[PDB]
Subunit: 140 residues, 4 copies
Amino acid sequence: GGNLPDVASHYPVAYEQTLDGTVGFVIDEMTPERATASVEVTDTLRQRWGLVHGGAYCALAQMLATEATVAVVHEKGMMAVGQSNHTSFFRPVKEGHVRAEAVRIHAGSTTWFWDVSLRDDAGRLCAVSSMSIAVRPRRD
Amino acid sequence: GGNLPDVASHYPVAYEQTLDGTVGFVIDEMTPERATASVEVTDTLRQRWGLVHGGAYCALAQMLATEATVAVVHEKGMMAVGQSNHTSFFRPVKEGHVRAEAVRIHAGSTTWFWDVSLRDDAGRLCAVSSMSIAVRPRRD
Amino acid sequence: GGNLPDVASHYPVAYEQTLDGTVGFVIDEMTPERATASVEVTDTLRQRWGLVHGGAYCALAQMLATEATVAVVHEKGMMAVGQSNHTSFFRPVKEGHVRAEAVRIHAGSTTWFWDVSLRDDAGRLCAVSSMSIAVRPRRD
Amino acid sequence: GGNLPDVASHYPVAYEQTLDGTVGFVIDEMTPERATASVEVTDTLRQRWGLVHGGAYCALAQMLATEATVAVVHEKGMMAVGQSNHTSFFRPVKEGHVRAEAVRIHAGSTTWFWDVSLRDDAGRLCAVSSMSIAVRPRRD
Ligand SMILES: CC(C)(COP(=O)(O)OP(=O)(O)OC[C@H]1O[C@@H](n2cnc3c(N)ncnc32)[C@H](O)[C@@H]1OP(=O)(O)O)[C@@H](O)C(=O)NCCC(=O)NCCSCC(=O)c1ccc(O)cc1
Ligand SMILES: CC(C)(COP(=O)(O)OP(=O)(O)OC[C@H]1O[C@@H](n2cnc3c(N)ncnc32)[C@H](O)[C@@H]1OP(=O)(O)O)[C@@H](O)C(=O)NCCC(=O)NCCSCC(=O)c1ccc(O)cc1
Ligand SMILES: CC(C)(COP(=O)(O)OP(=O)(O)OC[C@H]1O[C@@H](n2cnc3c(N)ncnc32)[C@H](O)[C@@H]1OP(=O)(O)O)[C@@H](O)C(=O)NCCC(=O)NCCSCC(=O)c1ccc(O)cc1
Ligand SMILES: CC(C)(COP(=O)(O)OP(=O)(O)OC[C@H]1O[C@@H](n2cnc3c(N)ncnc32)[C@H](O)[C@@H]1OP(=O)(O)O)[C@@H](O)C(=O)NCCC(=O)NCCSCC(=O)c1ccc(O)cc1
């Protein structure tokens, strides 16, 4: 579901039940250095003024950047979790899709850093989100 | 109606269909300088690893900081929208609630800044979110 | 005069006495969309542990992003100032130079956003700095 | 010099020669949870338009937050270095002093997080800076 990296035999929460399944995030491409994902805008993505919620751009960036890290480190016995997210909002999105492209810009032993651009259907850059992903050894 | 500030007679999206109403955000207190909100953790707030989604903390902080700005400025002919958000994640939340407390730290003519704390049922500080809120004349 | 954009006949502080001239920042290229600058590492750029000061990367990014905004908007009656800066530090620099490359990513009516990369003499990416630049009518 | 924590018998760079000594940063109070410092504004602190440089607020926050961490962890065999700094600029400072107050808001095993308020001589809040400080075991 959502085409998230398949790194474990089971997961605590089914895709369709998570925030990500609820709003409809879907991953398209995914490599160690770059990953893309998108979502259809519907009310569930919007806030009361009719624009895509700022939290939705943060949430798509976070899932994409974290899972793109999980895709690499999980089989190395590590876990990956968001430690910091900085999002800037340049243009509202009223409808259509949001498309996210994540580029890896640093991969340290304790911290990976991704830049995520969020664009509307015309290709305009509506938001960007910088994420720092902590990598730590798994607890079992 | 999540108890959001009732500033207009019509809104483009009803509470219950917004991302906010979908995950269950509810505002408890609101004054010009300070506001609080909370949410019950359910799967809809979680990611597949069973923890509250990073985007959920961002979304809660975004709605609370923005709407507490709306509450003041709307009657002044102004629109308020999120311009930037920086969220840092200190401890995960697996279940219970997330409680948010937004404190206004600067109210400029064009920009309001709010610090938002996010705490678990034990009161521990699990994340913080700084929100910068652009304030502009409402377009006809 | 650090090669900063020559937009006015007088400036309140001469280059050589500013923080910029004190540490030795010099702009190499400037266009509306992209600009570069660099500095020689000396003790004046370092902290007591012998590494380049975190504030130095921030200062370089701040001067480069702002003044590249000044270069466009000054002749339009506008002032440009730093509104927010987020800097992330990936590898220390002990000696040599720091080279900065600022790329404009959004140019709004009130806000320009620039991403700045900071690299060592080996070309490695040592820090990044996102700058948000407020653009306002110049006060008489 | 500058009243920085005295944790080692020698340091790679003398205070008066560092960025911090050059601009005149001085620490006043310092405890595990809170630390204050200040600096006299002079041209060396300013940029060409006559206001305190954005980099100077970042640099005072960074030195104060990092050294406040060093004060605690150094005798535990750890080093502390800035990993991320997010600074927002609310009001310019033309002259007098900048006074920084750093409050610790989270102390993890790998990351300490400090909020630093920067005020002018009238007490007005002119900038804030959030820092994440990485703590790692020393390399010898
Ligand atoms: C933050 C962090 C330690 C995270 O490490 P990481 O993400 O785990 O990366 P990794 O550990 O993969 O190693 C990356 C590089 O970091 C350095 N590093 C990592 N761990 C250590 C360590 N325990 N000891 C020394 N260097 C280390 C080292 O350069 C390493 O390269 P290599 O020697 O292994 O090739 C690393 O990214 C880093 O060092 N970043 C740069 C930190 C920096 O230079 N910050 C700016 C200075 S902020 C401090 C400041 O301004 C200040 C001012 C005044 C004052 O009085 C005090 C402080
Ligand atoms: C960013 C902004 C303009 C936003 O304005 P706002 O949030 O709407 O606040 P508001 O407009 O309510 O006014 C707040 C104060 O800002 C100043 N200000 C605001 N608008 C203006 C304007 N159009 N013209 C002049 N001052 C203004 C003024 O001090 C005002 O106080 P008051 O005189 O109105 O009482 C305001 O918060 C601000 O001025 N912040 C401080 C900016 C600052 O000092 N940044 C760092 C330095 S500039 C970046 C830099 O380091 C650099 C380095 C080297 C170099 O070569 C060039 C630049
Ligand atoms: C922040 C700002 C207003 C700054 O404006 P700027 O940097 O000067 O850009 P500029 O003014 O050049 O205009 C860019 C676009 O912004 C929009 N915009 C700018 N000013 C205005 C205005 N006064 N009125 C309406 N739209 C405006 C408009 O789309 C404009 O495009 P155009 O129609 O002019 O072609 C603009 O960049 C912006 O609109 N960014 C997007 C803001 C956004 O979508 N944020 C997240 C959602 S709102 C936060 C939230 O999640 C929330 C959640 C729950 C809740 O209950 C309430 C809120
Ligand atoms: C980031 C970090 C690991 C840094 O750890 P630290 O600063 O070293 O703190 P310390 O390690 O002192 O321990 C703090 C707590 O962190 C947790 N933690 C630390 N290390 C680990 C670890 N190796 N394994 C599990 N938990 C850990 C643990 O809760 C610990 O408490 P305790 O069990 O020891 O009492 C910790 O601060 C943390 O876990 N922060 C919260 C991370 C978080 O919840 N982020 C939000 C989610 S972002 C991810 C996301 O949204 C996503 C969405 C969709 C999707 O498909 C995937 C991901």
